[PDB]
Amino acid sequence: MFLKNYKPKTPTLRFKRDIFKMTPFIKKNNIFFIKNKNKSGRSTKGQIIVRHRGANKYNKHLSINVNRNQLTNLAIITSLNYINKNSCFIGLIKYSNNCLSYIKLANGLFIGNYTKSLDKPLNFSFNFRNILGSFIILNLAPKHSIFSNLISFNKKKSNYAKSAGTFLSIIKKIKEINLFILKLPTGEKKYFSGDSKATLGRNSNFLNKFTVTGKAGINRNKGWRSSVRGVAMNPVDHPHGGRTKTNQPEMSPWGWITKKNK
Amino acid sequence: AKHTPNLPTHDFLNFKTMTGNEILLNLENYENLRPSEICGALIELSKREGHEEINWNEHEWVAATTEHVTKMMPTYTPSVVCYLMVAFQRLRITHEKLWKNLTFAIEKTIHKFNAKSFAYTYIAYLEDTSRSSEEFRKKLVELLPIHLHQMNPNQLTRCFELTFERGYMNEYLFEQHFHVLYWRRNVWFGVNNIIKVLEIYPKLNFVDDCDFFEGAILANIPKVKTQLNEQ
Amino acid sequence: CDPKLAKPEIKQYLTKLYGLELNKVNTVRYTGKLKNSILRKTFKTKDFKKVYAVLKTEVEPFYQKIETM
Amino acid sequence: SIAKQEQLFQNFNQKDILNPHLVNSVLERNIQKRTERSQKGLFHGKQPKTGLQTCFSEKKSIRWWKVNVHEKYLWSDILQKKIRIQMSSKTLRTIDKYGGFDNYVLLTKPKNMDSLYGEYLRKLMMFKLKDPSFKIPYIQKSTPVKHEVQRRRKVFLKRPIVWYPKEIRNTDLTQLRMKLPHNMSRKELEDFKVMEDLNEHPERITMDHPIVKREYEKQMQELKALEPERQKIMERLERYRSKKTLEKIKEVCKQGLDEWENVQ
Amino acid sequence: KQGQNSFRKRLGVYSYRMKHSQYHKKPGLIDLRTKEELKKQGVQGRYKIYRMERDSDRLFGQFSARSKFLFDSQRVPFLDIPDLTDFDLKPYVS
RNA sequence: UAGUAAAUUUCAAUAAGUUUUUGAAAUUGAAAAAUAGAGAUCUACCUCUAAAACUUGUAAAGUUUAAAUUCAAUAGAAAACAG
RNA sequence: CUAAAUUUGAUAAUCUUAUUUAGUGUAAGUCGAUUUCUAAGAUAUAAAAGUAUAUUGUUAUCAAUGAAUAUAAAAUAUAAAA
RNA sequence: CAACUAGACGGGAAGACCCUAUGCACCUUUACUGUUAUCUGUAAUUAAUUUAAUUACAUAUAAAUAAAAUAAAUUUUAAUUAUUUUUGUUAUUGAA
Numbered sequence A: 001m002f003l004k005n006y007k008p009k010t011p012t013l014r015f016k017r018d019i020f021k022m023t024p025f026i027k028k029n030n031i032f033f034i035k036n037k038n039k040s041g042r043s044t045k046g047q048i049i050v051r052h053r054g055a056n057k058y059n060k061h062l063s064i065n066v067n068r069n070q071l072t073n074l075a076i077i078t079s080l081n082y083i084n085k086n087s088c089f090i091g092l093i094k095y096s097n098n099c100l101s102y103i104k105l106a107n108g109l110f111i112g113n114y115t116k117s118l119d120k121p122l123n124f125s126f127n128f129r130n131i132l133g134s135f136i137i138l139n140l141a142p143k144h145s146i147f148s149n150l151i152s153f154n155k156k157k158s159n160y161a162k163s164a165g166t167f168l169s170i171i172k173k174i175k176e177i178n179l180f181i182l183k184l185p186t187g188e189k190k191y192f193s194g195d196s197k198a199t200l201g202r203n204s205n206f207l208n209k210f211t212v213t214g215k216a217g218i219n220r221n222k223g224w225r226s227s228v229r230g231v232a233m234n235p236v237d238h239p240h241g242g243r244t245k246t247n248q249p250e251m252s253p254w255g256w257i258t259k260k261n262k
Numbered sequence B: 001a002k003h004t005p006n007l008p009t010h011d012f013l014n015f016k017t018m019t020g021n022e023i024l025l026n027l028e029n030y031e032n033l034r035p036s037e038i039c040g041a042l043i044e045l046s047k048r049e050g051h052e053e054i055n056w057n058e059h060e061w062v063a064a065t066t067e068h069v070t071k072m073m074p075t076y077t078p079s080v081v082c083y084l085m086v087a088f089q090r091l092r093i094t095h096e097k098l099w100k101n102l103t104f105a106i107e108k109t110i111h112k113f114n115a116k117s118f119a120y121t122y123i124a125y126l127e128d129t130s131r132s133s134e135e136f137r138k139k140l141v142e143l144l145p146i147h148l149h150q151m152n153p154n155q156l157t158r159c160f161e162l163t164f165e166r167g168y169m170n171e172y173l174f175e176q177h178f179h180v181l182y183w184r185r186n187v188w189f190g191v192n193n194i195i196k197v198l199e200i201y202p203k204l205n206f207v208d209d210c211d212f213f214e215g216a217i218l219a220n221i222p223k224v225k226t227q228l229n230e231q
Numbered sequence C: 001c002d003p004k005l006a007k008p009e010i011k012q013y014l015t016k017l018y019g020l021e022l023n024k025v026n027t028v029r030y031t032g033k034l035k036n037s038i039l040r041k042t043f044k045t046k047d048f049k050k051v052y053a054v055l056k057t058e059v060e061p062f063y064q065k066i067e068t069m
Numbered sequence D: 001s002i003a004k005q006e007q008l009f010q011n012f013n014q015k016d017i018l019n020p021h022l023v024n025s026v027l028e029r030n031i032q033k034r035t036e037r038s039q040k041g042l043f044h045g046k047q048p049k050t051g052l053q054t055c056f057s058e059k060k061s062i063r064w065w066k067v068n069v070h071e072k073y074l075w076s077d078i079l080q081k082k083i084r085i086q087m088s089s090k091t092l093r094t095i096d097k098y099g100g101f102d103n104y105v106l107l108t109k110p111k112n113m114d115s116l117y118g119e120y121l122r123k124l125m126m127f128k129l130k131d132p133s134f135k136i137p138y139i140q141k142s143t144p145v146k147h148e149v150q151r152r153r154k155v156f157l158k159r160p161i162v163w164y165p166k167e168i169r170n171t172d173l174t175q176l177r178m179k180l181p182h183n184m185s186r187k188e189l190e191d192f193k194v195m196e197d198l199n200e201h202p203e204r205i206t207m208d209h210p211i212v213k214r215e216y217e218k219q220m221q222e223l224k225a226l227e228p229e230r231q232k233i234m235e236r237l238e239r240y241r242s243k244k245t246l247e248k249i250k251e252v253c254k255q256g257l258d259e260w261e262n263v264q
Numbered sequence E: 001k002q003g004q005n006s007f008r009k010r011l012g013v014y015s016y017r018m019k020h021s022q023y024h025k026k027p028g029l030i031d032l033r034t035k036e037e038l039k040k041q042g043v044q045g046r047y048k049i050y051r052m053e054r055d056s057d058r059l060f061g062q063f064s065a066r067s068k069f070l071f072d073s074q075r076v077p078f079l080d081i082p083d084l085t086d087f088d089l090k091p092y093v094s
Numbered sequence F: 001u002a003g004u005a006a007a008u009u010u011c012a013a014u015a016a017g018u019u020u021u022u023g024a025a026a027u028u029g030a031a032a033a034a035u036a037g038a039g040a041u042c043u044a045c046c047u048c049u050a051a052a053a054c055u056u057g058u059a060a061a062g063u064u065u066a067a068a069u070u071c072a073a074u075a076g077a078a079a080a081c082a083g
Numbered sequence G: 001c002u003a004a005a006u007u008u009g010a011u012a013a014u015c016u017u018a019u020u021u022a023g024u025g026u027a028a029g030u031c032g033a034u035u036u037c038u039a040a041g042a043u044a045u046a047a048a049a050g051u052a053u054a055u056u057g058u059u060a061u062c063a064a065u066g067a068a069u070a071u072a073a074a075a076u077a078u079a080a081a082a
Numbered sequence H: 001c002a003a004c005u006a007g008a009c010g011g012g013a014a015g016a017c018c019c020u021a022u023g024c025a026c027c028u029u030u031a032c033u034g035u036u037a038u039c040u041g042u043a044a045u046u047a048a049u050u051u052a053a054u055u056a057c058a059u060a061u062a063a064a065u066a067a068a069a070u071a072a073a074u075u076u077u078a079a080u081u082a083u084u085u086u087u088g089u090u091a092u093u094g095a096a
């Protein structure tokens, strides 16, 4: 879960920085794993609809309990695995009934740690006195806390903070009407209910922000192809195309203005 | 001919329109029909007029039809078994070898039943104490709340009575599963299913610490009146 | 033979009619090849099937090949 | 019979009006001048048209008029079912005249009601009168079809969310799920207020209490079932050869636990 | 050789030997020339082919999920050929 | 043949590029032969008519035959066995 | 492959993967396919929707370039292996 | 005959550049006319009451919370709470 500063034995390893993907601690399974068709920015009729997208050597799917309401036993963590699209880690979880699943892990966890889901107040977890990375109801939480994968009361799935190093800070708590006012990563505010649910602690890989690819072939092997300027392009192909590289206004090929107030 | 109806490939037989008599002819050919075709033949007799006055245990081909099933019962798929049960249930049929091989064909498949297909077992085996042992019934009660919450309303109250008259009902089932539904999910059942409720709660030595007679049921009846008839 | 036929039909067709005992029956299919008329218009010939009937008994080579010439 | 829409259903029987494959042969065809929607619904002879828009300089271009549509569900007192219906604003203007919907289908002439779907409903509504022992389980095109999931996600259903072992897959795992108040029983509401109060006064928490005695037994049994899997873990790290990579990670994982300790 | 070219496109597939070894599906049950046209008819051709393979006389026994094949002698046609010993008639009349 | 006749804005076809009429889309919706509508915008007078259905078999390409009008092998047909 | 002949084989030709005429020849309870399974995909298509006839196609049939298999046969349920 | 290429304004494309034609194509723009995306008031779908909100009708998802159809279980699958939708579609006005 740490950065690697490489010694400049090549041009591309001079600035590169990447995370230890922890292959020794990834016991791979065939229970949660599918590999679907790679969608290269196309529809079913073959036509490109979103550009700059292609082959992905790291295509997979791993089914996850974003919602951990269905069991309350205590658990451990046997192993780990990595996700690419959000650059987040996960970890298996073995419940005391020998059950199994994957979960979103929080920052500060690792093999050997414990985790559970909580129906009742905090004093009634005699196991698992530490509380990080646990599925909990927002009312049954401290004054100060931060949530990372939120499931609203009027909803099945989670729609906020699912990316790396994110959270949802609390601004207020209104237990009267059971209505919380949480902050998003941007800064906007949203009404949520304390009957809703979420995880505790920021999601894994806080340190993706301190990354440098250093090689074009690290994106090509994800499904990120080569972009092209609208200025090298011919006037047929793009509304900037031509010999002049200056342009009032600054536009998009389907026709609309990108830069506003500008 | 232009404008043909674009019909599928499968050569199966739709009895759903046939007269009752036209079904019996095709049941003569029981050794060859497929098991999914028998299910659609027998269940529909129940839907045809004049099935009560008859005792199908004595009818020739219906009798042989069973004796073909009892051999080839464990070969059948788990869905099929729930389709036969109802058909022999609805036809008032008594055949000891039949109700052995169903039960051993259901202990296998009890884990692949839809909730709706778990109910038709829970009624058939508790509507008659002779069709099985009690050990098998005790398993069903130990499996009910898996499927309870998801079943139809008309399918619960039939599963709520068959507990009480037989006496398998506990405090566990009543306070955890049943009473919560009637106390929260109250008129969703409808009027024809709440009548039966109010004849059972008094028999149960029940307390009414709850305030749901007034607040949950009686205050919430007039939100349904379209269902009400003279009866 | 006519190439529509099959072995188990050929088997009982012989044992019932000619009444000869057999151990094994084989089969091979050929396609009629294309040729040219005198006026040089093409025409395809007929497709035919061969049968190598194995027997228990002995056979004289008058039926097995053509005479020594 | 001068209506082409009547000739088609004309020779049907009380037994052939049920074959859905055959009716769809008749409703999914094309009539000379009428649209393909106007037979799916009950427009009162109305169709769209074309023409020529104009300008200041009198140039001209094709323009499309279109017909009002009012998607709606209606109940037929005879058949005792709901039916979807697309219709104009002339039908609404007329249904109030003739009175109810089952009189529009049943008194109009097909020349004015230029639908097929309006005559399919007509003949299902006369047989029911000529024989109330007429079982109509499903009306055709009555309602659309709703799937469970999209076509994209048909694959992800294959693999299981939590894998239960063989002994446990089919039991009552019902008290184990996380319990909101509206879902949970009477005794547990009362126990919750007890649990809700002693959170504020943990001096009063002792093993000399029913609830605490009830819980501490349960939770310590769960921990004891994990120590084998714990010991299997700590051996892996022990026999793992590189320790710098381990000491490196513990420097990171501590940075998370420190934040969680001192939140602000 | 001469004049064989356009005559041979027209035949197309007149035999099972032509295409790769994994092309002909359920060969003997239907004649090729009726099968190869229907596959040009698109959709209903497939459906029509499937209905004939279902209802084909020349299937002398059902298939199996494995490479082995099941042989039922009752689907085989039968011949009423009697014995001809002590048979006085002969194929020409005096 | 009452959600009809007719009306307002637009378009279409009516010889008319404009001012009717006949019909359509949207919106409104009548009376009872004592009534109603057309008659190149509106008014009056008068005249005419009564806003339901049905009805004219052989059309068409292809083959063959008989006849008229034509070519006679670089013509006639793309082809005197050629799609 | 065999026999016979010489007509545009970049010469000649008694020769033939120039050309012409004819005849012979590929033996399967197992191998290789067919068959079963499924991927990308196709589709006057079930149900149902959209809509001007301006279109779709969660089914079904078809479709390896993939996975497994010969001796008793078919099927449901479970687990493991290839 | 072998060899060479000085000339036959040498041979090969009704050639290259240039001009005309009330010829063409493709591209550009604060060229002319215009179409569409898109913005907008009224009206219909659309109802009641109160002083613009509230309710009513209606659509759908979720909360351990009915389904149905496509061969295989016969009676509006209408409770509550929260949220979503008509920021719609059609005729029309003017702008673009």
Ligand SMILES: [Mg+2]
Pocket (backbone or CB within 6 Å): A047, A048
């Ligand atoms: Mg494109």
Ligand SMILES: [Mg+2]
Pocket (backbone or CB within 6 Å): A051, A052
């Ligand atoms: Mg991009």
Ligand SMILES: [Mg+2]
Pocket (backbone or CB within 6 Å): A227, A228, A229
């Ligand atoms: Mg670029």
Ligand SMILES: [Mg+2]
Pocket (backbone or CB within 6 Å): A232, A233, A234
């Ligand atoms: Mg350039």
Ligand SMILES: [Mg+2]
Pocket (backbone or CB within 6 Å): A236
């Ligand atoms: Mg362009």
Ligand SMILES: [Mg+2]
Pocket (backbone or CB within 6 Å): A235, A236, A238, A239
């Ligand atoms: Mg441009």
Ligand SMILES: [Mg+2]
Pocket (backbone or CB within 6 Å): none
């Ligand atoms: Mg420059």
Ligand SMILES: [Mg+2]
Pocket (backbone or CB within 6 Å): C027, C028
């Ligand atoms: Mg062979």
Ligand SMILES: [Mg+2]
Pocket (backbone or CB within 6 Å): B006, D024, D028
């Ligand atoms: Mg259809």
Ligand SMILES: [Mg+2]
Pocket (backbone or CB within 6 Å): D069, D071
């Ligand atoms: Mg619509």
Ligand SMILES: [Mg+2]
Pocket (backbone or CB within 6 Å): E018, E019, E020, E021
């Ligand atoms: Mg080959």
Ligand SMILES: [Mg+2]
Pocket (backbone or CB within 6 Å): E067
């Ligand atoms: Mg084989």
Ligand SMILES: [Mg+2]
Pocket (backbone or CB within 6 Å): none
């Ligand atoms: Mg005009």
Ligand SMILES: [Mg+2]
Pocket (backbone or CB within 6 Å): none
């Ligand atoms: Mg004109």
Ligand SMILES: [Mg+2]
Pocket (backbone or CB within 6 Å): none
């Ligand atoms: Mg007018």
Ligand SMILES: [Mg+2]
Pocket (backbone or CB within 6 Å): none
């Ligand atoms: Mg008019």
